[PDB]
Ligand binder design. Structure first.
Ligand SMILES: N#Cc1ccc2c(c1)c(-c1ccc(C(=O)O)cc1OCc1ccccc1)nn2C(=O)c1c(Cl)cccc1C(F)(F)F
Ligand SMILES: N#Cc1ccc2c(c1)c(-c1ccc(C(=O)O)cc1OCc1ccccc1)nn2C(=O)c1c(Cl)cccc1C(F)(F)F
Lengths: 262, 261
């Protein structure tokens, strides 16, 4: 169906575009998390949060602290959506799809991709922020009041298991493309070219994982099994947000801000 | 990890055990559903009157309850058939005993949905070992919550059935579902994953040999193991709500144990 050279070309194409599209790759994030490269500024409690937003001055972080961090996660997610959207245009065939289907694939895909790429920034002890210039501890995030603490912890829980696959950026670039080209998103008009592109991406991912992880038994199957979960986690996620909206009233934004985050 | 001759041997073993464990294969269900055979034709239940004729042909409760209890009775038998099949999977009975219980507890429902599809087409489902056929339309028109309890099974089945898997494919697929290392509370994840790795390898080769023109059927089938997780969760959220409303219903103790947490 496809030749190995075409699959390697597709894989290289996607890695290159993935490098241009996302500000902090997994390779650089890991160097920061491990201690293998200016230490990031560490946020571990209320006082160090206050110094970090007065020193680094995070555009997301800057009345109650738990609310402020939660909304900072939203600000960054909105940024990620545009980065993923630009990445999608580099996937071969994507821009030739019907315009409504492009929108639909992005609309229902970004949540899964944001979770996936968040893991690249996370270890069991915390998460990089502001392009790796800061590090906020898991314990500080989990200890936020209300439901905000239990909103943060499931991301870490997923990340630790996903990170045990030890995927690198060239693996992730194809994996992310596969998620986008999901022919079962609701309301798609023309499923057939979407599945045709996804089939080529899956062949590419399969070959990429055998060449890059030749000792990792059935990694391909295990990664698709993670694409199973991601569906669940995302559904859990939206049910968490809606509960927050109906319970909390200290969370009103300028109506324009609400529209941006709609 | 395993060689192809070993993978083909595992596939044949599993298909043999599957035939021995499940009385109504997909091959026989399809022969019944397709027809042009006088001897295998089912009696079709499509409304209240034909249900009552069916009990005098195929062989005090409100109709939706009676149908619902028929589903439970057969689900319990399915659990029994799946348990018997599971013990034939190499390595399964050598696992920690608590993990065997745990794998069955979280696996039977996903398997029941998978094998229910074999009995289904877009118009209804085989019952009574294929002697009867109850229409989708009749099931969906049951009152209360029972009508919409039936329909999602059909929605999954029409999509799963588009893969056109036969029984030798399904025997390996079902084994993979059972040997899932991510079930909550497992004690020894690694020996389960080691078994699943061999079953996945076996499934991969089996689908390439049996569906050589079916591009990426392996990946599409594992993606189906996605939905199944969703369907099962919707199922229990319906089943519990029904439990809280209806008391003319009692669940079989085997099923009761499975749904606890
Ligand atoms: N620790 C943690 C934590 C917890 C919940 C989170 C996130 C982080 C993030 C997130 C995603 C991507 C990136 C990135 O740099 O690539 C950075 C992120 O946060 C950095 C950050 C950490 C600490 C305080 C402020 C910001 N997103 N998010 C969501 O909740 C989320 C998700 Cl996963 C998917 C879709 C939509 C959303 C959201 F809109 F609702 F936010
Ligand atoms: N159409 C349809 C329909 C709809 C809901 C159903 C079922 C069928 C079945 C079921 C499962 C396996 C088999 C089999 O022959 O292998 C047969 C089945 O039904 C046949 C049949 C249909 C109509 C009237 C009488 C019998 N089970 N079930 C459940 O609801 C179910 C499930 Cl999936 C898992 C666990 C527990 C349950 C239950 F206890 F709650 F019932």
């Amino acid at each position: 169906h496809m030749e190995s050279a075409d699959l390697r070309a597709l894989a290289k194409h996607l890695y290159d575009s993935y490098i241009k599209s996302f500000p902090l790759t997994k390779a650089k994030a890991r160097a920061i998390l491990t201690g293998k490269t200016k230490s990031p500024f560490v946020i571990y409690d209320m006082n160090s949060l206050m110094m970090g937003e007065d020193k680094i001055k995070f555009k997301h972080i800057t009345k109650e602290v738990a609310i402020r961090i939660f909304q900072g996660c939203q600000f960054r997610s909105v940024e990620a959506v545009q980065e993923i959207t630009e990445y999608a245009k580099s996937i071969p065939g994507f821009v030739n799809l019907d315009l409504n289907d492009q929108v639909t694939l992005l609309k229902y895909g970004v949540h899964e991709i944001i979770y996936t790429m968040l893991a690249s920034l996370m270890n069991k002890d915390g998460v990089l922020i502001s392009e790796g210039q800061g590090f906020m501890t898991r314990e500080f995030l989990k200890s936020l009041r209300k439901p905000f603490g239990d909103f943060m912890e499931p991301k870490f829980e997923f990340a630790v298991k996903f990170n045990a696959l030890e995927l690198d950026d060239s693996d992730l670039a194809i994996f992310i493309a596969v998620i986008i080209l999901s022919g079962d998103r609701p309301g798609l008009l023309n499923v057939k070219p979407i599945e045709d592109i996804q089939d080529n991406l899956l062949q590419a991912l399969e070959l990429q994982l055998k060449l890059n992880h030749p000792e990792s038994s059935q990694l391909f199957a295990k990664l698709l099994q993670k694409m199973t979960d991601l569906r669940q986690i995302v559904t859990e996620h939206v049910q968490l947000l809606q509960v927050i909206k109906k319970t909390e009233t200290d969370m009103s934004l300028h109506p324009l801000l609400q529209e941006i985050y709609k």
